[PDB]
Protein backbone atom coordinates (compact mmCIF):
# COMPACT_ATOMS: atom_id res chain seq x y z
CA UNK A 1 0.00 0.00 0.00
CA UNK A 2 1.27 3.50 -0.83
CA UNK A 3 1.99 5.58 2.34
CA UNK A 4 -0.52 8.37 3.09
CA UNK A 5 0.83 11.85 2.15
CA UNK A 6 -0.11 15.22 3.75
CA UNK A 7 1.31 17.28 0.82
CA UNK A 8 -1.43 19.11 -1.16
CA UNK A 9 0.57 18.85 -4.46
CA UNK A 10 1.13 15.08 -4.02
CA UNK A 11 -2.56 14.53 -3.10
CA UNK A 12 -3.64 16.42 -6.27
CA UNK A 13 -1.18 14.33 -8.35
CA UNK A 14 -2.65 11.05 -6.90
CA UNK A 15 -6.21 12.24 -7.70
CA UNK A 16 -5.19 13.19 -11.29
CA UNK A 17 -3.43 9.79 -11.80
CA UNK A 18 -6.52 7.94 -10.49
CA UNK A 19 -8.70 10.04 -12.88
CA UNK A 20 -6.35 9.11 -15.79
CA UNK A 21 -6.67 5.38 -14.85
CA UNK A 22 -10.52 5.72 -14.91
CA UNK A 23 -10.38 6.97 -18.53
CA UNK A 24 -12.39 4.35 -20.56
CA UNK A 25 -13.79 2.27 -17.59
CA UNK A 26 -11.18 -0.52 -18.13
CA UNK A 27 -10.59 -0.54 -14.31
CA UNK A 28 -14.18 -1.89 -13.78
CA UNK A 29 -13.62 -4.93 -16.05
CA UNK A 30 -10.15 -5.63 -14.51
CA UNK A 31 -11.38 -4.83 -10.94
CA UNK A 32 -8.15 -2.92 -10.17
CA UNK A 33 -8.09 -0.33 -7.35
CA UNK A 34 -7.36 2.80 -9.42
CA UNK A 35 -6.96 5.02 -6.29
CA UNK A 36 -4.35 2.73 -4.75
CA UNK A 37 -2.61 2.29 -8.15
CA UNK A 38 -2.59 6.09 -8.69
CA UNK A 39 -1.06 6.43 -5.17
CA UNK A 40 1.67 3.81 -5.90
CA UNK A 41 2.63 5.48 -9.25
CA UNK A 42 2.88 8.90 -7.50
CA UNK A 43 4.89 7.42 -4.60
CA UNK A 44 7.39 5.82 -7.03
CA UNK A 45 7.79 9.19 -8.89
CA UNK A 46 8.30 10.97 -5.53
CA UNK A 47 10.92 8.38 -4.35
CA UNK A 48 13.02 9.10 -7.51
CA UNK A 49 12.79 12.96 -7.51
CA UNK A 50 12.31 13.55 -3.68
CA UNK A 51 11.00 17.09 -4.41
CA UNK A 52 7.74 18.69 -5.78
CA UNK A 53 9.54 20.92 -8.34
CA UNK A 54 8.69 21.43 -12.04
CA UNK A 55 10.61 18.15 -12.82
CA UNK A 56 8.17 16.18 -10.60
CA UNK A 57 5.10 18.01 -12.03
CA UNK A 58 6.35 17.42 -15.63
CA UNK A 59 6.88 13.71 -14.85
CA UNK A 60 3.35 13.27 -13.38
CA UNK A 61 1.81 15.23 -16.34
CA UNK A 62 3.66 13.00 -18.85
CA UNK A 63 2.21 9.83 -17.18
CA UNK A 64 -1.34 11.28 -17.09
CA UNK A 65 -1.05 12.23 -20.81
CA UNK A 66 0.16 8.71 -21.79
CA UNK A 67 -2.60 6.99 -19.67
CA UNK A 68 -5.24 9.24 -21.35
CA UNK A 69 -3.93 8.63 -24.91
CA UNK A 70 -6.90 7.44 -27.01
CA UNK A 71 -4.40 5.89 -29.53
CA UNK A 72 -2.82 3.68 -26.80
CA UNK A 73 -5.58 2.22 -24.52
CA UNK A 74 -3.38 -0.93 -24.16
CA UNK A 75 -0.83 0.96 -21.99
CA UNK A 76 -3.54 1.86 -19.43
CA UNK A 77 -4.95 -1.72 -19.52
CA UNK A 78 -1.43 -3.18 -18.95
CA UNK A 79 -0.89 -0.79 -15.96
CA UNK A 80 -4.35 -1.66 -14.48
CA UNK A 81 -3.65 -5.42 -14.96
CA UNK A 82 -0.26 -5.15 -13.15
CA UNK A 83 1.71 -6.25 -16.29
CA UNK A 84 3.54 -2.94 -15.82
CA UNK A 85 4.32 -2.47 -12.09
CA UNK A 86 3.76 1.09 -10.68
CA UNK A 87 7.55 1.59 -10.06
CA UNK A 88 8.46 0.60 -13.65
CA UNK A 89 5.69 2.86 -15.05
CA UNK A 90 7.11 5.68 -12.86
CA UNK A 91 10.59 5.27 -14.55
CA UNK A 92 9.64 4.31 -18.15
CA UNK A 93 10.57 6.66 -21.00
CA UNK A 94 8.16 8.34 -23.46
CA UNK A 95 9.52 5.83 -26.05
CA UNK A 96 8.79 2.76 -23.87
CA UNK A 97 5.23 4.05 -23.08
CA UNK A 98 4.41 4.63 -26.80
CA UNK A 99 1.89 2.54 -28.81
CA UNK A 100 3.27 -0.68 -30.33
CA UNK A 101 2.69 0.84 -33.82
CA UNK A 102 4.69 4.01 -32.90
CA UNK A 103 7.48 1.87 -31.32
CA UNK A 104 7.75 -0.25 -34.48
CA UNK A 105 7.68 2.91 -36.68
CA UNK A 106 10.54 4.48 -34.60
CA UNK A 107 12.51 1.18 -34.76
CA UNK A 108 12.10 1.09 -38.57
CA UNK A 109 13.11 4.78 -38.98
CA UNK A 110 16.16 4.18 -36.71
CA UNK A 111 17.10 1.05 -38.76
CA UNK A 112 16.71 2.99 -42.05
CA UNK A 113 18.76 5.95 -40.76
CA UNK A 114 21.51 3.45 -39.73
CA UNK A 115 21.34 1.75 -43.19
CA UNK A 116 21.53 5.09 -45.07
CA UNK A 117 24.57 6.22 -42.98
CA UNK A 118 26.44 2.93 -43.66
CA UNK A 119 29.26 3.60 -46.14
CA UNK A 120 28.99 1.62 -49.38
CA UNK A 121 31.48 -1.28 -49.34
CA UNK A 122 34.05 -0.56 -52.10
CA UNK A 123 33.17 -2.71 -55.14
CA UNK A 124 35.41 -5.23 -56.96
CA UNK A 125 35.61 -8.94 -57.93
CA UNK A 126 36.06 -11.15 -54.85
CA UNK A 127 38.62 -13.91 -55.47
CA UNK A 128 40.64 -16.65 -53.73
CA UNK A 129 43.26 -16.61 -56.56
CA UNK A 130 45.37 -14.06 -54.62
CA UNK A 131 47.19 -14.85 -51.34
CA UNK A 132 47.84 -11.83 -49.10
CA UNK A 133 51.60 -11.33 -48.41
CA UNK A 134 50.92 -10.00 -44.82
CA UNK A 135 48.21 -12.29 -43.35
CA UNK A 136 48.56 -15.26 -45.85
CA UNK A 137 44.73 -15.42 -46.24
CA UNK A 138 43.09 -15.81 -49.70
CA UNK A 139 40.12 -13.42 -49.14
CA UNK A 140 40.98 -10.72 -51.73
CA UNK A 141 39.15 -8.31 -54.08
CA UNK A 142 40.59 -7.21 -57.43
CA UNK A 143 39.90 -4.53 -60.06
CA UNK A 144 41.56 -4.12 -63.49
CA UNK A 145 42.37 -0.67 -64.97
CA UNK A 146 47.00 -3.27 -64.31
CA UNK A 147 45.32 -5.46 -61.66
CA UNK A 148 44.78 -3.76 -58.25
CA UNK A 149 44.25 -6.21 -55.33
CA UNK A 150 43.00 -5.55 -51.76
CA UNK A 151 42.99 -8.11 -48.94
CA UNK A 152 39.57 -8.03 -47.19
CA UNK A 153 41.10 -9.35 -43.91
CA UNK A 154 44.09 -7.02 -43.21
CA UNK A 155 43.41 -4.17 -45.71
CA UNK A 156 46.78 -4.74 -47.50
CA UNK A 157 46.79 -3.36 -51.09
CA UNK A 158 49.09 -4.26 -54.04
CA UNK A 159 49.14 -4.26 -57.89
CA UNK A 160 50.19 -6.51 -60.79
CA UNK A 161 51.53 -5.11 -64.08
Partner 1 sequence: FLLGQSARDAERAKDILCRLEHTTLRKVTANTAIYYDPNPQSTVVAEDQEWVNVSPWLLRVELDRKHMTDRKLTMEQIAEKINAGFGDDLNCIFNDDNAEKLVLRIRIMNDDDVFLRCIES
Contact residues for partner 1, defined by CB under 8 A: 61-62, 64-66, 68-69, 71-72, 94-95, 97-99, 102, 106, 109-110, 112-114, 116-118
Contact 158, 149 (CB under 8 A): yes
Nearer to partner 1, 99 or 139 (CB): 99
Instruction: Give the strand pairing for 140-144 and 157-160.
Output: unpaired
Is 161 marked within a binding site?
Answer: no
Round to whole Å and give the CA distance between 102 and 99: 5
Minimum distance from residue 38 beta carbon to partner 1 (Å): 16
Nearest distance, CB of residue 109 and partner 1, angstroms: 4
Does the annotation flag 151 for ligand binding?
A: yes
Rank residues 44 and 92 by Cβ distance to partner 1 and give the closer one.
92
Q: Which is nearer to partner 1, 101 or 131 (CB)?
A: 101
Contact between 2 and 54 under an 8 Å Cβ cutoff? The reply is no
Sheet of 147-151: strand order equals 125-127, 140-144, 147-151, 157-160
Query: Which residues contribute to the annotated binding site for Zn(2+)?
Result: 132, 135, 151, 154
Amino acid sequence: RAPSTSDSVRLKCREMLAAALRTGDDYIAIGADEEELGSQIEEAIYQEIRNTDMKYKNRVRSRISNLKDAKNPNLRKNVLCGNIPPDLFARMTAEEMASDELKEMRKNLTKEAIREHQMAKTGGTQTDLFTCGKCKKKNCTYTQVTTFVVCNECGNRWKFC
